[PDB]
């Protein structure tokens, strides 16, 4: 997901000016081109959430009794005691990924709230995590079919070319290997904060672009002054039309550059959204034989995790 932004041409170009409203009208539909461009981006961001986070319309939950077969899944499971539903691994994902918003809303930059809130994202993830442990790959191709967890590990070894007999003697060995690999995730996100920098650039490119668009209001753009009331209260009405025209045409290209930059950046986010939708389906729901798709090594299962303006995939591989 990318930050949604809507811009109005009337006030941002020239505010609190009655004479400028007639000069801006001479440009016709120029506002309509920019308004519909940012509107289509705001709708496209909400579309990327429905095709990635929630694959199915059915919600699955964890039974009160828990037998995991020796593994510890409590790290990826949500905590019902907390007021907000989140997992233990999602604690670092939300905290390490970061007022500026209200300061930019004064100049005409409106940040639209997303259709999908943060509380409902973890509810989609908890449905896929509770289902994968119980039903495995069955609920993706049809109705949910409960299967013992010992039998689910047997088929995932069969697809990679390993006879299911290897699992039985290794039940105690794999139990220590799986639980130790999950514990390394908590130490990796706490000590190393650069692993989440992929989602930090999305916020940085959006914050720098908004701050860049604001700083153009202070520039004179070759005119006498950037203040509208300073020109109207000094020069003559026929003379002020020359200075105001220099301020308008300078702010038309600056606003057009931002909208063009958002259309190019939204194409990269849309390309990554379709990729995350394919990773979610093949790696999590089912089992993919593709190399370097679900990660290095022979793939077994994947655990999705909620992240701000993105998603985190925890892959389990056979090395």
């Amino acid at each position: 997901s990318m930050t949604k932004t809507s811009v109005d041409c009337t006030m941002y170009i020239c505010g609190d000016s009655t004479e400028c409203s007639n000069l801006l009208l001479q440009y016709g539909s120029f506002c309509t081109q920019l308004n519909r461009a940012l509107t289509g981006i705001a709708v496209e961001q909400d579309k990327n959430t429905q095709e990635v986070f929630a694959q199915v319309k059915q919600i699955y939950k964890t039974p009160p009794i828990k037998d995991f077969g020796g593994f510890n899944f409590s790290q990826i499971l949500p905590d019902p005691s907390k007021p907000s539903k989140r997992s233990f691994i999602e604690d670092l994902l939300f905290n390490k990924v970061t007022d500026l918003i209200c300061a930019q809303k004064f100049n005409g930059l409106t940040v639209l709230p997303p259709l999908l809130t943060d509380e409902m994202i973890a509810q989609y993830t908890s449905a896929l995590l509770a289902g994968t442990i119980t039903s495995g790959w069955t609920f993706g191709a049809g109705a949910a079919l409960q299967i013992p967890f010992a039998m689910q590990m047997a088929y995932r070894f069969n697809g990679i070319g390993v006879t299911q007999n290897v699992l039985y003697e290794n039940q105690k060995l794999i139990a220590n290997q799986f639980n130790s690999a999950i514990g390394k995730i908590q130490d990796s996100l706490s000590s190393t904060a650069s692993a989440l920098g992929k989602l930090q650039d999305v916020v940085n490119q959006n914050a720098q672009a908004l701050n860049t668009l604001v700083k153009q209001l202070s520039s004179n753009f070759g005119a006498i002054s950037s203040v509208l009331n300073d020109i109207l209260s000094r020069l003559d009405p026929p003379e002020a039309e020359v200075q105001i025209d220099r301020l308008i045409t300078g702010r038309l290209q600056s606003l057009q550059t931002y909208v063009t930059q958002q259309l190019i950046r939204a194409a990269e986010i849309r390309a990554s959204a379709n990729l995350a939708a394919t990773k979610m389906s093949e790696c999590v729901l089912g089992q993919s034989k593709r190399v370097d798709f679900c990660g290095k090594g022979y793939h077994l299962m994947s655990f999705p995790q909620s992240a701000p303006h993105g998603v985190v995939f925890l892959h389990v591989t056979y090395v």
């Binding site: 909400d46 039974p63 009794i65 709230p113 079919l145």
Partner: protein, 77 residues
Amino acid sequence: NVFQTRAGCLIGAEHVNNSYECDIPIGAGICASYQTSQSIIAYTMSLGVENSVAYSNNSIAIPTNFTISVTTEILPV
């Protein structure tokens, strides 16, 4: 009907504590729908029907029947 929500002032709608499948987008976890002497109602988005799947060590399920379904897909070229 003067109401307020996370999105802002919303007039012409009625808040409903029930949660149903909704279409018209609003944002901030809100929808708007025309239902029952009928008007527009607004309520928090619903996740669908809740189904608790049983889990046990010896419990397993296998399909005893199957249905062949044909879907459609449309993409621009």
